[PDB]
Design goal:
The complex is a heterodimer.
Chain A lengths: L2 H7 L2
Chain B lengths: L1 H19 L4 H8 L9 E3 L2 H6 L7 H24 L10 H22 L1 E2 L2 E4 L4 E4 H5 L6 H15 L5 H12 L10 H22 L6 H29 L7 H7 L4
Parallel strand pairs in B: 1-4
Antiparallel strand pairs in B: 2-3, 3-4
Helix pairs in contact in B: 1-4, 1-8, 1-9, 4-5, 5-7, 5-8, 5-10, 7-10, 8-9
Classes of the chains: A mainly alpha, B mainly alpha.
Bound molecules: the ligand CCc1ccc2ccccc2c1CNC(=O)c1c(OC)cc(O)c2c1OC1=CC(O)=C(C(C)=O)C(=O)[C@]12C.
Protein name (chain A): Peroxisome proliferator-activated receptor gamma coactivator 1-alpha
Organism (chain B): Homo sapiens
Protein name (chain B): Peroxisome proliferator-activated receptor gamma
Chain lengths: 11, 260
């Protein structure tokens, strides 16, 4: 998991 | 009709842009020119004024650099939110979404930073502060040479006189670049960009009827921004290598890691 992915998945 | 849909897309992007980015170019120029009523920005032009305005907005050079990093991190999050509003973006392979942001965020940061700049300085802290270009350029190396490039670009880019409606589409086109290194599914991205490009062309023809050359110039600016970011990343790897005890934010480290 990456920080960019986490930001992208946050609804 | 097709054109009507392109205008609806342009409006959607503008509305999303306004929701994602607190300080728009319209709000920024209203402050720079001084045609507003709210409290004017505190001016920082030297070491002394910087000390005084800390509440309004390590050695100075490092302190200023860290300040830019904090704003960059906030900016990356705003750009990510905007990207998610571009039709079709969230349906792309998740890893491709990451790749588009990784390679596109700094190009967008340079672009949008220009909105808050003039030949003499840059607005900071949501426009509550104004730091002069001369002050930032006077910073000891390799920090002074890190600030100036953004102003050099801003001066040229601002000469194009784009407004927020133009910028919203321009930014979208940049994010949806099908030629970023490592993308897995190129066609879906190229198809979205082709439509965004049509929307941008119509936007410029209607909004800047007396400047036929604007679209072509903006396409060239997209190309220039890549070389511009390359130099940015390089000057940064130098700082992270020559400046000991330097702290690079995790989000920024992730974006810079393995970047072309
Ligand atoms: C997007 C970040 C970026 C990248 C390159 C730039 C090159 C030239 C000018 C501004 C640049 C900027 C924008 N830079 C800024 O917005 C910026 C700045 O610019 C000099 C100086 C500065 O002092 C600060 C800035 O933003 C800040 C947020 C913080 O959290 C700080 C705290 C509390 O410590 C800061 O220190 C602030 C107030």
């Amino acid at each position: 998991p990456s920080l960019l992915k986490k930001l992208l998945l946050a609804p | 009709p097709e054109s009507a849909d392109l205008r609806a897309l342009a409006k959607h992007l503008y509305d999303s842009y306004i929701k994602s980015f607190p300080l728009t170019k319209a709000k920024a120029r209203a402050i720079l020119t001084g045609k507003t009523t709210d409290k004017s920005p505190f001016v920082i032009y030297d070491m002394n004024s910087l000390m005084m305005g800390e509440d309004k907005i390590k050695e100075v050079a490092i302190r200023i650099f860290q300040g830019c990093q904090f704003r960059s991190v906030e900016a990356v999050q705003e750009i990510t939110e905007y990207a998610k509003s571009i039709p079709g973006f969230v349906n792309l392979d998740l890893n491709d979404q990451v790749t588009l942001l990784k390679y596109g965020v700094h190009e967008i940061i340079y672009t949008m930073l220009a909105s808050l700049m003039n030949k003499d300085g840059v607005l900071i802290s949501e426009g509550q502060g104004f730091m002069t270009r001369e002050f930032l350029k006077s910073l000891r190396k390799p920090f002074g040479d890190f600030m100036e490039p953004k102003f050099e670009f801003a001066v040229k880019f601002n000469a194009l006189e784009l407004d927020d409606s133009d910028l919203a589409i321009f930014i979208a086109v940049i994010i949806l670049s099908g030629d970023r290194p490592g993308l897995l599914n190129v066609k879906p991205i190229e198809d979205i960009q082709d439509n965004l490009l049509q929307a941008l062309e119509l936007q410029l023809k209607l909004n800047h009827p007396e400047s036929s050359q604007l679209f072509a110039k903006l396409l060239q600016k997209m190309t220039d921004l890549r070389q511009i970011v390359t130099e940015h990343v390089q000057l940064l790897q130098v700082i992270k290598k020559t400046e000991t005890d330097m702290s690079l934010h995790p989000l920024l480290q992730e974006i810079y890691k393995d970047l072309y």
